[PDB]
Amino acid sequence: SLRPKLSEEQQRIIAILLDAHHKTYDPTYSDFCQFRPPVRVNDGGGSVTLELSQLSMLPHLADLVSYSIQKVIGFAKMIPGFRDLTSEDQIVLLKSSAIEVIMLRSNESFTMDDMSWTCGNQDYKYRVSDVTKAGHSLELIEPLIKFQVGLKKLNLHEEEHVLLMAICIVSPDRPGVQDAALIEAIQDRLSNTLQTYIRCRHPPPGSHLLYAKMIQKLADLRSLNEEHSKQYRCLSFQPECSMKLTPLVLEVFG
Numbered sequence: 001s002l003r004p005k006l007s008e009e010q011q012r013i014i015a016i017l018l019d020a021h022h023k024t025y026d027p028t029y030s031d032f033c034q035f036r037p038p039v040r041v042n043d044g045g046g047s048v049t050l051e052l053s054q055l056s057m058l059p060h061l062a063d064l065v066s067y068s069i070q071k072v073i074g075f076a077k078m079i080p081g082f083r084d085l086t087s088e089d090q091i092v093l094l095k096s097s098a099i100e101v102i103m104l105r106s107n108e109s110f111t112m113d114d115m116s117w118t119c120g121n122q123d124y125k126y127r128v129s130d131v132t133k134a135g136h137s138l139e140l141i142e143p144l145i146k147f148q149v150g151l152k153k154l155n156l157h158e159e160e161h162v163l164l165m166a167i168c169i170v171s172p173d174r175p176g177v178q179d180a181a182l183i184e185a186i187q188d189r190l191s192n193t194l195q196t197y198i199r200c201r202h203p204p205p206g207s208h209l210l211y212a213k214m215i216q217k218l219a220d221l222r223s224l225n226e227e228h229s230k231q232y233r234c235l236s237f238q239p240e241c242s243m244k245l246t247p248l249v250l251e252v253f254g
């Protein structure tokens with residue numbers, strides 16, 4: 001019913017987050033050619049044995065995820081209030097949300113045209129088959145694609161997109177956080193900004209219960225996070241796997 005206007009502070013928060021995202025997310029994916037090259041072994045049969053023996057796409061995807069974690073760290077540091085947190089809590093939040101923010105931000109390259117993450121020519125077009133070539137199974141891939149399509153269909157404004165990533169990172173219910181109260185205060189400031197923005201800037205019918213749908217996606221991410229963690233564990237058992245990853249990836253998921 002009531003549609004209060006965005007306060008000057010809330011307008012500032014949105015501007016800061018849009019700027020932060022524009023500085024940390026290259027929509028041309030021009031740095032991707034710097035990663036170890038993607039390699040696609042012939043695996044039409046989806047052989048787990050072959051996939052683990054080769055892990056052909058792991059070096060490239062590990063580099064992409066590692067690169068993305070660095071960008072997420074940069075984005076997070078610009079979130080209003082994040083700097084008010086202790087270094088210890090900042091690191092806990094970054095490590096726990098990293099994979100979730102990667103899944104969220106990747107929605108920008110994801111396309112329902114062919115259900116792929118298109119970041120350039122054929123070489124930089126990622127499909128579910130590339131994820132299997134990196135050692136992951138359908139238990140993660142299936143819900144991941146469903147998540148991407150569900151998020152796509154929300155038709156989020158960039159303002160809503162960056163606020164969702166910020167809310168995801170600044171979550172007081174992450175294991176190991178010390179000052180949950182401060183984190184919750186910061187998240188509430190971001191959540192109220194999002195709710196206010198939706199109610200006065202998002203036209204119908206796409207605004208109908210949009211906030212609730214966005215919050216549900218954060219729950220979905222928790223599930224994907226746990227599943228990715230389980231599979232990363234299996235992946236780590238493969239001899240020589242560490243060399244195909246990166247020090248940052250090893251720390252965040254190890």
Ligand SMILES: C=C1/C(=C\C=C2/CCC[C@@]3(C)[C@H]2CC[C@@H]3[C@]2(C)C[C@@H](CC(C)(C)O)CO2)C[C@@H](O)C[C@@H]1O
Nearest residue numbers: 061062064065068103105106109117126131134232
């Ligand atoms: C990263 C990003 C992009 C795409 C994301 C993808 C396409 C390739 C496979 C990934 C990156 C998937 C998200 C999760 C999925 C994943 C399930 C995670 C990886 C898991 C490892 C590291 C092997 O354990 C393998 O595949 C491209 C761009 O929009 C920036 C964004 O920042």
